[PDB]
Amino acid sequence: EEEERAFLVAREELASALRRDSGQAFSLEQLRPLLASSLPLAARYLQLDAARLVRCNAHGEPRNYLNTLSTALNILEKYGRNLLSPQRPRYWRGVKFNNPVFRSTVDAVQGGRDVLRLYGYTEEQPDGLSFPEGQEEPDEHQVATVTLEVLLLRTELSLLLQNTHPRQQALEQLLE
Amino acid sequence: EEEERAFLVAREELASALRRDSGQAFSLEQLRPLLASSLPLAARYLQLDAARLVRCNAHGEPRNYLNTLSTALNILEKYGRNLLSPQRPRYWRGVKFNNPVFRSTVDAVQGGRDVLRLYGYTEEQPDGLSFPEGQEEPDEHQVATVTLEVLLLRTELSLLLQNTHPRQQALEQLLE
Amino acid sequence: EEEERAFLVAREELASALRRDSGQAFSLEQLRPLLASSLPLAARYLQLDAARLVRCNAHGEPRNYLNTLSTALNILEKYGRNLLSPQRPRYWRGVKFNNPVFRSTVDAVQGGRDVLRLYGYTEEQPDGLSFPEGQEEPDEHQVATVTLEVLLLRTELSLLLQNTHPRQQALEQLLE
Numbered sequence: 126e127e128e129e130r131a132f133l134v135a136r137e138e139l140a141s142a143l144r145r146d147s148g149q150a151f152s153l154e155q156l157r158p159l160l161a162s163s164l165p166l167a168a169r170y171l172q173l174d175a176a177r178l179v180r181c182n183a184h185g186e187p188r189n190y191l192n193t194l195s196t197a198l199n200i201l202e203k204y205g206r207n208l209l210s211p212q213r214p215r216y217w218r219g220v221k222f223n224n225p226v227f228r229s230t231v232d233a234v235q236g237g238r239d240v241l242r243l244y245g246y247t248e249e250q251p252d253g254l255s256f257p258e259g260q261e262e263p264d265e266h267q268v269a270t271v272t273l274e275v276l277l278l279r280t281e282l283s284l285l286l287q288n289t290h291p292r293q294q295a296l297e298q299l300l301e
Numbered sequence: 302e303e304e305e306r307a308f309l310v311a312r313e314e315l316a317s318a319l320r321r322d323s324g325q326a327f328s329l330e331q332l333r334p335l336l337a338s339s340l341p342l343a344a345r346y347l348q349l350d351a352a353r354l355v356r357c358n359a360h361g362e363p364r365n366y367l368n369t370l371s372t373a374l375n376i377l378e379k380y381g382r383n384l385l386s387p388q389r390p391r392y393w394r395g396v397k398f399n400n401p402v403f404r405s406t407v408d409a410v411q412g413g414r415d416v417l418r419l420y421g422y423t424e425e426q427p428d429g430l431s432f433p434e435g436q437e438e439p440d441e442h443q444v445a446t447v448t449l450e451v452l453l454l455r456t457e458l459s460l461l462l463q464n465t466h467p468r469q470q471a472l473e474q475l476l477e
Numbered sequence: 478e479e480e481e482r483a484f485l486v487a488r489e490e491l492a493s494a495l496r497r498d499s500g501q502a503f504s505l506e507q508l509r510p511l512l513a514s515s516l517p518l519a520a521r522y523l524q525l526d527a528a529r530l531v532r533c534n535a536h537g538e539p540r541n542y543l544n545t546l547s548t549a550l551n552i553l554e555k556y557g558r559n560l561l562s563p564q565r566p567r568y569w570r571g572v573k574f575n576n577p578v579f580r581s582t583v584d585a586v587q588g589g590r591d592v593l594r595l596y597g598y599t600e601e602q603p604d605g606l607s608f609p610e611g612q613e614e615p616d617e618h619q620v621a622t623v624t625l626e627v628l629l630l631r632t633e634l635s636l637l638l639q640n641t642h643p644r645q646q647a648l649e650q651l652l653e
């Protein structure tokens with residue numbers, strides 16, 4: 126109720142900020158209402174499958190797999206920002222699996238390819254994903270809300286590795 | 302390849318045996334052409350998401366989570382066998398999430414519900430999954446195929462816990 | 478009956494052994510005095526609600542629900558051993574319900590949370606159970622007693638599943 130409805134406002138606030146300037150950086154104080162919230166995972170992440178992304182890649186030491194996941198999300202965050210840019214990349218319509226950055230970051234995480242589908246890369250090819258040929262422009266609101274959750278989850282993982290998460294003790298008990 | 306053709310004829314034979322008698326037990330001898338197999342995991346399990354079922358539930362000690370996965374697969378295997386039985390259960394068309402057996406086994410592993418969808422439980426309700434209202438009879442070939450893959454994966458986990466897997470040393474290095 | 482004093486001498490031996498070194502395992506021969514005892518259940522288990530742990534979870538085939546209970550007790554036994562360890566885990570004061578191991582093992586069994594309360598996790602929060610903030614150290618004598626009983630029940634169930642329980646036939650006539 127109180128925390129819920131407030132969480133959705135800051136969510137749509139920062140999301141609409143991404144649509145205005147997709148290259149804008151967000152400080153810790155700007156993301157604090159979303160990082161310090163005690164709402165369940167299913168309430169904070171509506172599109173990004175944060176549960177499967179963490180659970181299906183939590184192999185080995187957290188210091189390693191939290192870094193593997195966060196770096197993959199950094200790459201996925203850049204894909205979402207490029208779709209909201211005033212000057213979109215030339216090949217924005219598709220992503221190739223054999224890209225060296227993609228292969229070493231996103232394709233090192235189970236579920237990384239599924240995040241692209243949330244952006245709109247829903248058409249599967251033997252060597253990549255692409256937008257439907259009938260789609261002229263990406264859904265700016267759908268892309269922005271997914272981009273924010275990717276950025277939020279990456280920030281959460283990054284703060285945990287830095288021992289600076291607002292709920293660091295609570296989250297660490299979910300990994301040990 | 303050569304081993305690919307040998308795996309298909311074995312898989313179709315045990316599936317036919319499942320349709321012939323869904324209550325019969327398969328010894329390790331009858332399952333050796335599929336257990337002692339060397340093909341990759343993606344070639345042995347064509348429908349059962351074995352990769353996610355293990356990776357997304359490999360938390361804690363292998364002795365524990367392999368037991369949680371085996372028991373969940375034992376329950377799922379019984380669901381598929383019941384769908385092929387001549388005396389089908391009067392409630393074969395739906396599975397309830399609050400069922401005590403289902404809740405303590407299948408709903409204890411991420412991806413357990415998705416296996417029922419492979420059987421044909423595609424329609425989702427807040428209380429469970431059910432067959433389409435128009436589907437008169439289950440897909441016998443589809444149920445037998447998935448049931449065989451469930452039985453295969455459960456056997457692999459059980460043999461690994463018993464230290465009797467044909468490739469026990471090779472698979473154990475995939476858990477370190 | 479004087480077989481209760483024999484139970485007590487062995488119980489206190491293994492209980493004191495748990496506090497001296499919480500990591501040392503117990504062989505089948507060391508536990509045989511308690512496993513083969515003809516004492517009633519209410520006399521062998523003084524704190525662990527063994528009657529409810531079995532009865533309230535005996536749904537489906539015994540081969541399945543005995544495995545579910547045994548795995549939950551394996552996790553609960555580890556919680557007790559960690560509380561008696563010289564190098565206690567940094568988060569010993571509380572247990573989170575969302576922990577992946579806990580959710581799939583202890584919380585799959587009715588009464589699992591109650592065992593944590595016997596250890597000292599009496600304060601209930603929406604996120605889990607925790608020790609009272611005033612308690613500087615856990616009750617080493619109470620935890621060792623509960624831990625030994627958890628270990629005893631798990632061994633009883635695991636031996637029953639292996640068809641090696643000293644009173645296998647007598648116990649099997651309580652489940653069929």
Ligand SMILES: Cc1c(Cl)cccc1Nc1ccccc1C(=O)O
Binds near residue numbers: 165175177
């Ligand atoms: C967000 C997060 C991070 Cl960054 C690291 C480690 C854990 C979490 N949390 C969760 C992850 C998967 C499933 C549930 C949860 C939960 O919070 O209940």
Ligand SMILES: Cc1c(Cl)cccc1Nc1ccccc1C(=O)O
Binds near residue numbers: 356475
């Ligand atoms: C079959 C199995 C068991 Cl039983 C236990 C542990 C691992 C496996 N294998 C795999 C499971 C998931 C993803 C990949 C593999 C692989 O081996 O390539």
Ligand SMILES: Cc1c(Cl)cccc1Nc1ccccc1C(=O)O
Binds near residue numbers: 527528529637651652
């Ligand atoms: C100990 C045990 C196991 Cl391990 C398995 C199955 C049954 C038992 N026994 C009992 C369990 C619940 C309530 C009463 C009894 C009794 O023995 O009177």
